[PDB]
Amino acid sequence: THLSVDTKFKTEGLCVDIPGIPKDMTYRRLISMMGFKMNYQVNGYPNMFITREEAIRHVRAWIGFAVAGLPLQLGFSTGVNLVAVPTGGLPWNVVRIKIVQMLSDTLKNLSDRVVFVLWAHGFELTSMKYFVKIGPERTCCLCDRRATCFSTASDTYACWHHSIGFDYVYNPFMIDVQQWGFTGNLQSNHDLYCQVHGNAHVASCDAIMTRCLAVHECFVKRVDWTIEYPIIGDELKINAACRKVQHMVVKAALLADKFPVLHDIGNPKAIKCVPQADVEWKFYDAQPCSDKAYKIEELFYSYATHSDKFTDGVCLFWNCNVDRYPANSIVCRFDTRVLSNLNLPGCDGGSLYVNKHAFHTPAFDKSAFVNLKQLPFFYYSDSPCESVPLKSATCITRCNLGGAVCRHHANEYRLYLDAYNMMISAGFSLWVYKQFDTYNLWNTF
C-alpha cells in the first residue's frame, strides 16, 4: 500500500493567495504545483505524502514544519527558525545547509527518514523546492543506510550520519494534519489537549503545535498492540531488567504482607508476572486485548472514581499511569523528563516512549505518589542455597542470616543489582504502600 497520488487534497486550509482553478485538486497536481517531477513510483517513492498509518509507523521521523514570512521564516518542531532572503535575513545556500545539519543531528539515532508534519497554508509547500530534491530511493555513498541527503557540489547521497556539508534534504515524507477532518485553525485544535505549547508568532511554535496535535490524534487515546517499532537502543536489556525487577518486587510484597488478592490494573493480556504465587490474581485494563477480554474487567482507573474500590489486597500499577495511586499500591512509573532516543516529545508535558510499542505517558508528577514511598533496593530469594564474600544488609537470603552468602545467591544478587541499576538509568522509578518493610521478608526464613 501507499497514499495514491490521485487521492483528493482539500484546499480549504490554503491561504487566499494560493488558487484552486477547479478546487477538486489531487496530490499528483499539488506535487507538480510544488515544482517536483513524480517519475519515481517504480523506484520506491510513489508519493511525497503518506497515509496516517505510514506516519504512525515512522513517528520517530516526525518534524513539525511551518513557514510564517520576499523573505520566508522556516520553523521546525526542534525550535529552530531560519529566515531565507531570496535573490532578486540569510541566503538559501546557507539555510539549506543548516536545515540538513539540524535534521541529521535530530534524526540520525531515531530514524532512516524525515516525515514533515504540516498544517498546510500553502507557503510551506511552496518553500520545499528551495531545500528538497526527489528521485529514486538510494543508499548512502558511504553506508547501506537509505539516502536522506544530497550534495550538489559532488552529486553524492548521504544518510543522516554521513551528511556533513550536504545541502538538499532528499526524498522527505510529509503529512498534512488539515486532511484529517479538523475544523477551525491549528491553535483552536492544539489548545484542546495541551497548555504547554504557546502561540508566540514565530513559525517554530506552529511547527511544535502541529506535531503535538498529530501526536495527540495518533497516540494519546490507546496503545496499538499491532504496530511494532525497530530496536534503536538497549530496548532488549532494559525490558529484560524491568521484568526481572517486576517479578522480584511483586513476589516479595506477596510473601511479606500475604495479600489474598492482587489487582493488576493496566494488564490487557492477562499474563501474571509471578504465575506460581498463592493469591487470587485479578486483571483490569481500559482496553483489554479482545482474545483475553473474558477474564479482564474493562475499567479506566481514576482515584476520583475508584477510591471506594480495590478496598482489599494490593493494586499492581506496572506502568499504568493514573492521576493518583491509592495507598495499597505497587507502582512502576517512567519519568517523561529523561533524555533518551526511546523517549520523544509528547502532548501536554507528556512524552511518547517508543520501546517495541508507542506508549504516550502523561507528565511525571510527584503528587501522584502522595500516598506511597520509594521502594528501597533489596534482593530476595527463597530458592536452594547451593555452591570478596558478599557483605550486604540488602541480600535477603538464608545464607546471609549469619553465615557468608553462598556462591549462587551472591551471583544472583549482583545480576539483580545490574538489572535494577539498568531500570533506574532507563528512567523508571518504583513506589510502594508505606507499611512495606524488608523486616517481614527476614521472617519468611
Ligand X SMILES: Nc1ncnc2c1ncn2[C@@H]1O[C@H](CSCC[C@H](N)C(=O)O)[C@@H](O)[C@H]1O
Q: Amino acid identity, residue 16? A: V
| DSSP strands (E only) in 249-382 | 261-265, 280-285, 297-298, 314-318, 329-334, 343-345, 351-355, 357-361, 372-374, 379-380
Minimal distance in Å, beta carbon 159 to Cl ion? 9
Q: Is 342 in the site for ligand X (CB under 6 A)?
A: no
- Contact mark string toward ligand X, 347..386, x via CB under 6 A: ------------x---------------------------
d(Cα 326, Cα 309) in Å, to the nearest integer? 10
Q: How far is the CB of 213 from ligand X (least distance, A)?
A: 21
239 binds, options ligand A1JLH, Zn ion, Cl ion, none, Cβ within 5 to 8 A by partner type: ligand A1JLH
Helix (H) / strand (E) element for 291: namely: none
Told to check if 310 binds ligand X by CB under 6 A, we report: no
Site map for Cl ion, 209-238, x if CB under 5 A?
A: -----------------------x------
Using CB under 5 A as the binding rule, whether residue 161 contacts Cl ion is answered as no
Nearer to ligand X, 34 or 242 (CB): 242
Please report whether residue 285 would count as binding ligand X according to CB under 6 A.
yes
Stretch that binds ligand X, among 192-200, 208-216, 296-304, 363-371 (CB under 6 A): 296-304
What 4-12 contacts at long range (C-beta under 8 Å, 24+ apart), as own/partner pairs, is 4/47, 5/31, 5/38, 5/41, 5/46, 5/47, 9/176, 9/179, 10/178, 10/179, 12/178
State the nearest-atom distance from the C-beta of 135 to Zn ion, in Å: 17
Q: CA neighbours within 13 Å on the CB side: how many for 147?
A: 25
**Is 145 a residue that touches Cl ion (CB under 5 A)?**
no
| Shortest spacing between CB 161 and Cl ion, in angstroms | 9
Q: At residue 175, what are phi and psi to the nearest 5 degrees?
A: -140, 135
Identify what 385 binds: ligand X, Zn ion, ligand A1JLH, none; CB under 5 to 8 Å per kind: Zn ion
Please identify, using beta-carbon distances, which residue of 67 and 252 lies nearer to ligand X: 252
The answer to whether 214 touches 117, Cβ cutoff 8 Å, is yes
Nearest to 314 by CA among 298, 330, 325, 338: 330
Tell me how far CA of residue 432 lies from CA of 145, 256, 274, 393, in angstroms.
Answer: 45, 12, 17, 20
Helix (H, G, I), strand (E, B) or coil at 30: helix
For residue 383 the three cell numbers come to 530458592
What is 56-108 written as a DSSP string? HHTGGGEEEEEE---PEEEEETTS-EEEEBPP---BHHHHHHHHHHHHHHHHT
- Check binding of 410 to ligand X (CB under 6 A): no
Question: Does 126 contact ligand X by CB under 6 A?
Answer: no
Contact between 197 and Zn ion by CB under 5 A: the answer reads yes
Look at residue 142 and give the partner it binds from ligand A1JLH, Zn ion, ligand X, none, a contact being a CB closer than 5 to 8 Å depending on partner kind: Zn ion
* Residue whose CB is less far from ligand A1JLH, 235 or 412: 235
Residues 6 or more apart from 17 whose CB is under 8 A from it?
Answer: 122, 123
100 binds ligand X (CB under 6 A): no
Question: With binding defined as CB under 5 A, does residue 409 bind Zn ion?
Answer: yes
Min CB(180)–ligand X separation in Å: 23
Q: What 3-state DSSP class applies to 262?
A: strand
Under rule CB under 6 A, residue 274 binds ligand X: no
Cell representation of residue 206:
506552529
Residue (127 or 397) nearer to Zn ion, CB: 397
User: How many residues interact with ligand X (rule CB under 6 A)?
Assistant: 16
Q: Considering CB distances under 5 to 8 angstroms, the limit depending on partner class, which of ligand A1JLH, ligand X, Cl ion, none binds residue 424?
A: none
Site string for ligand X, 234-253 (x = CB under 6 A): --------------------
**What is the largest distance, in Å, between two alpha-carbon atoms of the chain?**
88
**Judged by CB under 6 A, which stretch of 90-98, 100-108, 123-131, 279-287 contacts ligand X?**
279-287
CB of 304 to ligand A1JLH, least distance (A): 20
CA distance 34 to 10: 16
Among 133, 161, 243, 244, binds Cl ion (CB under 5 A): 133
Amino acid symbol at 386:
E
Per-residue cell: 303: 482515584
Q: How far is CA 189 from the centre of its chain?
A: 21
Please report the sign of the dihedral spanned by the C-alpha atoms of residue 427, residue 433, residue 438, residue 443: negative
Applying CB under 6 A, among 64, 122, 172, 268 the residue interacting with ligand X is 268
3-state secondary structure of 403: coil
Residue ranges that bind Cl ion, judged by CB under 5 A: 133, 232, 351
Residue ranges that bind ligand X, judged by CB under 6 A: 223, 265-268, 285-287, 299-301, 318-320, 322, 359
